[PDB]
Symmetry: C3
Subunit: 334 residues, 3 copies
């Protein structure tokens, strides 16, 4: 097909955990969906202690934004590496076929840009990440990863083939960081990316993250930035981890329908308490809220969640159901 | 519904790996199932070396007991924290909906008790664990976790919808402990829980357990406490890990039907050699024994199993089948 | 049945990643399939630095060869431990039932041999490994593991029950090694296996591999030993990990049909980007190539892949499809 005959639509991405506007069931035929991302290397404070790292980002955020298209659309990405950056970057889409997911075609020095097109031939949520030859995990574990959702053209389906329609969607990107430590266990600091590289590699080779965070920082999805829902709403949470396994869990809830490895032609797993998203994967979980209050959404290695940062909150509005749960006798001394 | 109109049944729990009496197919309508657990903080010897830790337990054991109910029963738990304990505790049921699984409603100081009720709306095996705000992984990794099984009212089913009926059930709780180590690699010891806390946190943050055990100690499910079966018996092994991934395997056997993530509305995986139970999950495996002798049941990270403690035994009685396996030429020099 | 009435066929195994000749759909009735393996303890250089370890091998390779039979064939293995070796060895087949998978029946000192027969009653890919009582993980993590494929007699099937036929098969064995390190982080060296044992155990207990490799060494499946395919060919990649989780991913491709836990009576997962093979398991992924060029096949913990060794290449021949992917604007300064 002459791709020039297809509709084009442009999207300006939004910052995670929010997701750009889209339609679950495709309202048009196949399209070329145009996205632009600008790489930004920047300092980021990642913890309550004030630890500051040199992050490598797509569009200024960790994770990079969620892109949403439909099966057999074309994704056309304009990738810009401004001359204010220092490093070489590129992009690999796990949704794409060929050329290392695009990485072989998108190497951009500071001051350069490129435009890649690929056909989104498989439905699912997928990781995308930077992957410059010879320094792949350094870029990924500096925050340079996000996800893309390729919806079936007729939307999501349950294990029986019936429609599933979400009311709200959130994108949780989970990031393992490896801040180098000295003999004393203290964080080390670096003056240039080149002076950082070897100790960054050494720290990565411990296979022990110093931080594991949602949305780029300890506590990022809490407080005024807690996720929200109302009782009775259907919520899809897309969760990615570009480098390391995670095991998401909604404390006080479930995954009613879970694609743990993220690919929508498969039936979902039902009624999950916790699910395994392998490193290098995006998964998706659908839940209908049944109770109000605070929930925690965590990686259920609870050390990873509550000591290293992999925990966020939902604040849910509505009526309490005493049939589902009640305090029969409140805590007391007798 | 007026819950007061429903039958009540009381259960006194039994110590793992055994499971209180129950019926697979529900012989009554929905019920309120009453359980009582008493929290016990106690010293436990966890290895052959004599390493002694301060454990935090439900009902005196690591893991806590297995509770068994049916879908849409109500679980009513009386949780007692005697004044002989030091710490605040609570309980979160992954089977439950709302209030952080119950944790927000069950905070009990020493000298207090509480009664929680919830509706068991989803069938499966699920983790339960203590989760006091701000010190969650310390309690969990001190042994304060167990599991609950919510059976479908018509019992278990295979991948074709045919009944599966177990003859025996065992509950294996797998516990990761993080005993703090000094520069020399020697275990450190502590005089009060408060003096222990920071080094407990530091040890947890290594993400490297010092011990990984079944039923609370190295070798606990061996010798006079080996699990048992006869050739031809159908055995369900429920396995939980509240904090960290495991990969169970029956050495010399299989999981004929496995719910690796524990939720019975899903078809089981067939013929598994090894399966992944994510941290924060309970799974269940069904096997019909076909050969007698000793089996080892392990986490198949074999270092975790044979060096760190995650190994137990079955002793199986009956007739050897030489069709299935035989020594054609016994080991010899020729 | 009188097994003596069945056909016998002998196989001389081939070195991974290649696989001995076989037929997907069984062209005969059940057979006794005869294999011979000779244990070889040998020095192996495992990295670009020249690090040399004392490996323990089946048939001279890491991994050991892939054996291929059909469901309800009998496997008859002659296992030889020549008197040029130092250690006791045996073999445990995860495909087999009874006697610890064969390990209880196959203990051979140097100078001894044995012949084991078992019935391959379950279809799938399965791990086999050495497992001498008391020193199991040392042998496994010294390279003494491989895999066996038990094909359904009517070959592989998709999620709808339609045939899947591969054109090429490769076997990737992934090995975690634990070379002991001193305080400085330098590798230690040893003069005898007995003098090595305690520090080998200590290194294993870190749960942090020093090396994670395909086919026995960093870069083994690259260069002149890259895997190969043509556009349009259907390739099955069998992947095993006897001790530790992995998460395979074809960079630039997918797993079109994946049995992540390796058992062919289950429907495959479709369209996977990345999949979790638990330690102690073999999995299999089927892909039809659609683009030419270089691919990397990796464990998608990218530190594990690109720093520790778990990366190989495919070189794929054929026509580039610009519909599927194209550079619209090559990298440039504007
Ligand atoms: O609209 N994306 O930068
Ligand atoms: O980029 N990770 O959330
Ligand atoms: O910001 N110049 O590419
Ligand atoms: O900028 N190099 O493709
Ligand atoms: O169920 N909270 O870990
Ligand atoms: O929306 N619930 O009151
Ligand atoms: O909760 N009232 O005892
Ligand atoms: O009967 N449970 O303590
Ligand atoms: O509590 N864990 O077995
Ligand atoms: O043991 N008094 O709660
Ligand atoms: O005892 N406090 O809920
Ligand atoms: O199959 N035993 O590890
Ligand atoms: O029960 N078997 O002889
Ligand atoms: O096993 N008899 O040589
Ligand atoms: O033919 N196997 O050594
Ligand atoms: O033996 N492992 O590739
Ligand atoms: O090589 N003698 O067994
Ligand atoms: O060589 N011992 O079975
Ligand atoms: O998609 N390469 O990591
Ligand atoms: O085989 N492809 O030109
Ligand atoms: O790729 N041509 O600008
Ligand atoms: Cu980059
Ligand atoms: Cu990738
Ligand atoms: Cu507690
Ligand atoms: Cu929990
Ligand atoms: Cu051996
Ligand atoms: Cu094994």
């Amino acid at each position: 097909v002459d791709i020039s005959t297809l509709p084009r639509v442009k999207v300006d991405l939004v910052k995670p955990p929010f997701v750009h506007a889209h339609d679950q069931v495709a309202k048009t035929g196949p399209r070329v969906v145009e996205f632009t991302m600008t790489i930004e290397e920047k300092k980021l404070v990642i913890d309550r202690e004030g630890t500051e790292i040199h992050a490598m980002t797509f569009n200024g955020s960790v994770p990079g934004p969620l892109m949403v298209v439909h099966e057999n659309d074309y994704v056309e990405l304009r990738l810009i590496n401004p001359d204010t950056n220092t490093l070489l970057h590129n992009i690999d889409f796990h949704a794409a076929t060929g050329a290392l997911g695009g990485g072989a075609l998108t190497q951009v020095n500071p001051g350069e840009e490129t435009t890649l097109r690929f056909k989104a031939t498989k439905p699912g949520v997928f990781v995308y990440h930077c992957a410059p030859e010879g320094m792949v995990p350094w870029h990924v574990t500096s925050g340079m990863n996000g996800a893309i959702m390729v919806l079936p053209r007729d939307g999501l389906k349950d294990e029986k083939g019936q429609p599933l329609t979400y009311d709200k969607i959130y994108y949780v990107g989970e990031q393992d960081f490896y801040v180098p430590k000295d003999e004393a266990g203290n964080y080390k600091k670096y003056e240039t990316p080149g002076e950082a590289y070897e100790d960054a590699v050494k720290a990565m080779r411990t296979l022990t993250p110093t931080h594991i965070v949602f949305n780029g920082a300890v506590g990022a999805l809490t407080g005024d930035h807690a996720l929200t829902a109302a009782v009775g709403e259907r919520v899809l949470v897309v969760h990615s981890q570009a480098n390391r396994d995670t095991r998401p869990h909604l404390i006080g809830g479930h995954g009613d329908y879970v694609w743990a490895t993220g690919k929508f032609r498969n039936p979902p797993d039902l009624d999950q308490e916790t699910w395994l998203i392998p490193g290098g994967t995006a998964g998706a979980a659908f839940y209908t809220f049944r109770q109000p209050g605070v929930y925690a959404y965590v990686n259920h290695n609870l050390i990873e969640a509550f000591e290293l940062g992999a925990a966020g909150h939902f604040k849910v509005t509505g009526e309490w159901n005493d049939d589902l749960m009640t305090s029969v006798v409140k805590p007391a001394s007798m």
